[PDB]
Amino acid sequence: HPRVKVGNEYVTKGQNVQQVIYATGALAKAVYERMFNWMVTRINATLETK
C-alpha cells in the first residue's frame, strides 16, 4: 500500500503481486546503486592529504 500524494493529502494504492515484486526489485537496485556511489564519495573523502 504505497502512499501517493493527491493535493495536500496522501492516498493509499493497493499493489499487485507482480508489481510489488518489481517494486522490491527496484528498492534492491536503488539501495545497492546508492550504496556504491556513497562508497565512491567516501573514497573521494579520504584520498586527500590536503
Added chain:
Amino acid sequence: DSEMAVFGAAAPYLRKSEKERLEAQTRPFDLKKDVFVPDDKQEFVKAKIVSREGGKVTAETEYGKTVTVKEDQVMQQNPPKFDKIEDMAMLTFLHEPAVLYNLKDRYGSWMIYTYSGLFCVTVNPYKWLPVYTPEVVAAYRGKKRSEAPPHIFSISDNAYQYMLTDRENQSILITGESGAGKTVNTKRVIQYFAVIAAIGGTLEDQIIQANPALEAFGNAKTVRNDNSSRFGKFIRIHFGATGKLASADIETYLLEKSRVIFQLKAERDYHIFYQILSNKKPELLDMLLITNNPYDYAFISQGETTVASIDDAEELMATDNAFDVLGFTSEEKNSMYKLTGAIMHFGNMKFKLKQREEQAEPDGTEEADKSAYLMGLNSADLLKGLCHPRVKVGNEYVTKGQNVQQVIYATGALAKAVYERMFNWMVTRINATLETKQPRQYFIGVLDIAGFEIFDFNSFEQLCINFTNEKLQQFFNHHMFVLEQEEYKKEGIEWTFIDFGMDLQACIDLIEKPMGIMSILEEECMFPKATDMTFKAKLFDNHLGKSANFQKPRNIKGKPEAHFSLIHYAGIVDYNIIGWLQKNKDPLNETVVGLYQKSSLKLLSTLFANYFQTVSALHRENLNKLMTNLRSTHPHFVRCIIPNETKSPGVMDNPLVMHQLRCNGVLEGIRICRKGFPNRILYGDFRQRYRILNPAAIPEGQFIDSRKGAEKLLSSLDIDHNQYKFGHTKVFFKAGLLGLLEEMRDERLSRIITRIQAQSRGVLARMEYKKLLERRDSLLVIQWNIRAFMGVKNWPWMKLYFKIKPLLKSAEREKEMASMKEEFTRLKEALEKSEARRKELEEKMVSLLQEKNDLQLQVQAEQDNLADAEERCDQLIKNKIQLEAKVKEMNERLEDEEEM
C-alpha cells in the same frame, strides 16, 4: 464517587450516584425465580416463578396477573449487581428484555449514553443535561472508554487515539432512525475536536461554527425530531504528524432537496427560513424582502412553524456569527442570505392556465421580482425561461411549452437544485476555509446518515434514506458477524461459523442489481412515454413471485392509491410509487441553470459552474465509494435509538425501543463480541506498540520472527491465555482484552516517564552536587588565601619589604618576568590563532581553487545543457509542425466523410 467531581455540574447526568451503588447490593432478587415474560402491551415484563410442573411452568407477573408459557420462551433476569452497567457487552444474561430494561433503567435517570461492546447506544434525552458545555470537553481529553462514562466525546477521543497510534483513517459511524440522536452527537464530535485542538485559535472556533452553519441550511423539524438532519454528512477532521488539528473536510451525500418544497403535518421546512424570519432583524428584513410572517409562504407554512426546543430568535444570530467566524465576507454572507430569500419567495409564485395556449404563466410576480433582485438575475428573463424552457436533443435545441401541472414540478425541482448546489458550495467553502495547507496525513470520518424512517406516506427519498441505513446496517452486520469470522478463516483462527441471520444483501440486490428498483428507474426515466403505471407494472412483473421481501401493500390506513411494502431490517415500510421516476431522473430546466451560470452574483455563478447520471445512480455510486472508503478505515459504531414517539423526556415505549434494538442487531453484535475475537493486531504494530510492555520478551539487536515474538510477549503478560488465538498475520483477542492492554500500557508509560524523571532528577542533582562541591572547594581556597594573610599579619623583616616596592631583583626582575611573559603569552595567543586563521584561509583558497576550476568546466557543461535543451525544443517544434500537418489532413478527411 469522589472522582466524579471533575465533571462539575454535568456529573449527575453521566453516572449513577453513590446511593445507587449501595442500593444494588440490597435489592431483593432471586436468580432462579426472577425472569422476564412477554406481554401484549409491552414486550417484556418482570415475573416471579411460583411453581414447577415438568415441561410446563406457571408464574405470577409483577402486576399480579397469572401467566403460563413454556420454558423455551422464559429468560432469567439479570442480577441487580449488573443493573445499569455502562457497557451492555458485560451483561451476564443477554436477551431482548435484558437490553430493553438495561436501557430503560438508565434512560429513566437521564444517563443517556451506554456502550454495547464494539459500539455504543445513545437514547434521546429530549431535555437537556449540562453535558455539552466547554467544561466537560477538558474532562474527556485523552481519557479512555474504561475511564470516562459513556458519551459521544468518549468515542470521539477513542477514535483520535486510534488515529494517531495506527496512522490509519478512523471512523465514528452513528446510525439510527429519524429523531434518535445522530446529529447532535455529530456536533458534539465536532466541538470536541475543536475545543481539544485549541486548549490541548481561529480554526477551532471556525470548525465549531462549521456545524450550525450547515445545520441551519440542512436540518428541519420532523414528526420524529425537531432538528433532524435531512442530509447525510461525512466530516473528515485532519491532523498533522504532530497530531494537532490541521484541516477539516465536510462531505455531504443526500440533501432532502424535495423537503425544500413539500412537508407533511407536524414538521418544518429547513430551519434557516424560520430562524431568519423570527428575529425580524432589521438589516436582514431590509436586505431580504421578507418583512411578513412565515404563515403565508406555501412551501414552509404547512405543518408546524414553531417549536419550543429551538429558540428561533437566537439561531439567526448564531448563524450570522458562524459565518463571521468562518471568515465569510459581507458579499458571501449577503449573497447566501439573498438566495434563501429568493427560495422563500419562490414558493409563493402562482401559475395559471392561459385562456388559449394551455400553458402556465405567473399570476403574481412580486415574489419573483424579489427573488431575482436577491439572486442578481433578471425577473423577466427568469419567468420567460420558466414559461418557455428550452430542451435539447443532442446538439439541436427546441422549445417545449410547459403545462401548469408540469411546471409546478419543474419549479419544485429547480428549487431543489438551487438549494442542493448552494448547500454543496457552502460545504466546499467550509472546506476552503479550515484548509491551512499544513502537513496532513490522517482523518477521522464521522458519519451521520439520514435516518431510517416510516412516515404515513413514504416516497423515493424515503427509500434512498432507508437504503442508506440498510447499507450501513449490512456493513455493521458484515464487520461484526461475516467479515469477522471470514477473516478468522483467512487468518486460520480455529473458529466455527455462527449464522446470526443478520443479512440484507438480498434486499439490497433487489434494489441495486441490473434487475432491481434502481436499474428500473435508470431505464424508465429514458422512455419519454413512461408512466407511473408502466413503472408499477414492470416493477410488479419483475418482482412478484421473484422477491421474498417485496410484498403486496397492506393499506391498513386505507388510501390504496398506489402502494407496495418492503421488508426492511427495521420494519415493514409502505412506499408510494407516484412520482419516483421524476424524482430520480432529475430533469433540470437547462435555461435556469444557464442563467445561474450567467448570474451577476458571483456566488450563484459559482454554485452552478461546470454543470445518464440520475440521483439513484449518483447516490449508489457515492455510497459505494463511501463504504469502500469506510472499509479501509477502523470503525466505531454509535446506535441512536428514539425512546418515545410523544417526545416526552424519560417516557419510554418498550415495543418501539425493542423494535430498533432488534433491527440494528445490537443483540447479535453482542453475541459475536462476547463469543468471537473482535480485537486484532498486526504482529509488527503489536511488537512496535506494546514492546514497552516487556522489552525483554522481544530483545532487539537480534532477529526474531513476528509470529514467535508475539507468542512470547503475550505469553509473558500473565493474562488469561484462553482469551486469545493467533492468526496467519494478526493476533486475535477476546472482547475485553484490548482495553486491558491499553490500560496496562498507559500504566507502564506513567511508571516509566516518572522513572526516567527519577533518572533526570538524579543526574541533574548530581550535576548540581558536583558543581556545588567544586565551587565550594574553590571558596575554601579563597578562605585559605585570606587566612594566609592574617597569618602573614605577623612582624618579619619581609613584611616591610614585600608589600612596598624597593627591592630590585625580586620586585623588579619578577615584574620583568610578568610583563615580558604577559606580552609574550598575549601575542602567543594572537599568533597561534592567527596562524590557524591563515591556514584556514589557505584551505579555503585550495578548495575554492578546485571549485573555481570545476565551475569553469561546469559552465562549458552547462552551455552543452543549453545546446541540448535548445535542440530538444527545436526538434519538438519541428515534429509538432509535421504532426499539425497530419491532424490537419485527418480532421479534413473526417469532415469530408461526415459530408459524404
